[PDB]
Amino acid sequence: SKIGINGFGRIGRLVLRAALSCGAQVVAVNDPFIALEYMVYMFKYDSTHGVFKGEVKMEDGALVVDGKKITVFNEMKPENIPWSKAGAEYIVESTGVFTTIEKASAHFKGGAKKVVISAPSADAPMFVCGVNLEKYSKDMTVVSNASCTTNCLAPVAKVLHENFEIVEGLMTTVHAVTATQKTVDGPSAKDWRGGRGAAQNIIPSSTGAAKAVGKVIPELDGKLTGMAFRVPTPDVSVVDLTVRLGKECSYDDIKAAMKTASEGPLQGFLGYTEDDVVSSDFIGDNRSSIFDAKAGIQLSKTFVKVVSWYDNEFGYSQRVIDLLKHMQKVDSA
């Protein structure tokens, strides 16, 4: 394609990494609070996933990724930052704060052209590879890729709602740690989630599963809402989902619905292991939304329980890249 990145730190690494092996092309990297030498060791060496490969070294004004000429920009606040340099018309922002068109688009001034991001957003285009279909078209400057939780779910709905329709359902996600969770105990910050923890506590926490879903698959777009529980589980996570249903259920029926369908188009999204209680392995299995039958599956007529999953950290990597290609083609096509 041809792109650059906000935040060498988690999501990025792969974006860069996946874009390289996974998808493709060339670029540049934007990270004040991480320097040249670092980019190398850092991106190369990561606790969750293992190590890199290739060569993680800097030569000429920059870092050499499988020699695919790459660079680092220090800058705080995109504007400040070039981006013009290299010509990375398609940009991926991990970030945190940076949510919404302004700052996103702002990016443009410094350079940019198209912007697609890691994280939900109230104002601005919202997306994911699952149901995205026709949604995104040239009209577009910027778009977003559903949260770790969100992207995973959108898929689940499809076969359940479309095939089973769906009325009234709620949820929880037992999760693997994000940047935000701290060691020992102490302060915290916004929306709180009491930042008292790490190794000691199973921590209650919330989310925008509804909104995201709805917009990803409106119809739904209200018939859902959610919350969550964080554990020391560093990398990787699973979700529990609840629903009531019009067409009558058979646990045999459901997991199958997904399976057959699963086979289908969806691919980078789906899964279905009858296999057997896999904890949280995945973690670089190489799967998008990926679910299973049995697990803690349970059944009755109009009411049922289902559970799918995540391998967030990474998994998100592949559908941003997934989109970047869709995006790429779409726009310039």
Ligand X SMILES: NC(=O)c1ccc[n+]([C@@H]2O[C@H](COP(=O)([O-])OP(=O)(O)OC[C@H]3O[C@@H](n4cnc5c(N)ncnc54)[C@H](O)[C@@H]3O)[C@@H](O)[C@H]2O)c1
81 belongs to the binding site for ligand X (CB under 6 A): no
Helix/strand/coil percent split, the chain, to 5: 25, 25, 50
Instruction: Write down the catalytic residue from 129, 148, 152, 249.
Output: 148
105 belongs to the binding site for its own copies (CB under 8 A): no
x/- string (CB under 8 A) for its own copies, residues 300-329? Answer: -------------x----------------
Among 16, 89, 169, 235, binds its own copies (CB under 8 A): 235
DSSP 9-20: TTHHHHHHHHII
Our CB check for ligand X shows the closer of 181 and 257 to be: 181
Beta pairing, strands 298-300 & 303-307: antiparallel
61 belongs to the binding site for ligand X (CB under 6 A): no
The reply to whether 262 sits in an annotated binding site is: no
Q: How far is it, in rounded angstroms, from Cα 98 to Cα 75?
A: 14
Beta pairing, strands 171-175 & 29-30: unpaired
Q: How far is it, in rounded angstroms, from Cα 156 to Cα 292?
A: 11
Among 47, 60, 61, 97, binds ligand X (CB under 6 A): 97
Stretch that binds ligand X, among 27-35, 122-130, 278-286, 323-331 (CB under 6 A): 27-35
Among 4, 5, 6, 10, binds its own copies (CB under 8 A): 10
Q: How far is it, in rounded angstroms, from Cα 326 to Cα 333?
A: 9
6 belongs to the binding site for ligand X (CB under 6 A): yes
Amino acid at 279: S
For residues 187-216, which are near its own copies according to CB under 8 A?
187, 196-201
223 belongs to the binding site for its own copies (CB under 8 A): no
Stretch that binds its own copies, among 46-54, 146-154, 253-261, 262-270 (CB under 8 A): 46-54
Among 16, 31, 289, 322, binds ligand X (CB under 6 A): 31
Which residues are CB-contacts of 63 (< 8 A; sequence separation ≥ 6)?
29, 36, 39, 40, 56, 57, 70, 71, 72
119 belongs to the binding site for its own copies (CB under 8 A): no
* CA 306 to centroid of chain Cα atoms: 21
Number of H helices, E strands in the chain: 8, 17
Q: How far is it, in rounded angstroms, from Cα 243 to Cα 128?
A: 22
The reply to whether 10 sits in an annotated binding site is: yes
Residue 167 touches which member of ligand X, its own copies, none, C-beta under 5-8 Å by kind: none
The reply to whether 11 sits in an annotated binding site is: yes
Q: How far is it, in rounded angstroms, from Cα 224 to Cα 212?
A: 10
The reply to whether 31 sits in an annotated binding site is: yes
Exposure string over 140-156, b if 16+ CB within 10 A, otherwise e: bbbbbbbbbbbbbbbbb
* CA 216 to centroid of chain Cα atoms: 13
239 belongs to the binding site for its own copies (CB under 8 A): no
Stretch that binds ligand X, among 92-100, 157-165, 198-206, 269-277 (CB under 6 A): 92-100
User: Does 22 qualify as catalytic in the annotation?
Assistant: no
Which residues are CB-contacts of 230 (< 8 A; sequence separation ≥ 6)?
174, 175, 177, 181, 193, 202, 203, 205
Our CB check for its own copies shows the closer of 54 and 232 to be: 232
Residue 199 touches which member of ligand X, its own copies, none, C-beta under 5-8 Å by kind: its own copies
Q: How far is it, in rounded angstroms, from Cα 167 to Cα 169?
A: 7
Closest approach of Cβ 272 to ligand X, in Å? 23
Active site residues: 148
Residues in binding site for D-glyceraldehyde 3-phosphate: 147-149, 178, 207-208, 230
User: Can you give the binding site for its own copies, defined by CB under 8 A?
Assistant: 9-10, 33-34, 38, 42, 45-48, 177-187, 196-201, 232, 234-235, 313
User: Can you give the binding site for ligand X, defined by CB under 6 A?
Assistant: 6-11, 31-34, 76, 94-97, 118-119, 147-148, 177-179, 186-187, 312-313, 316
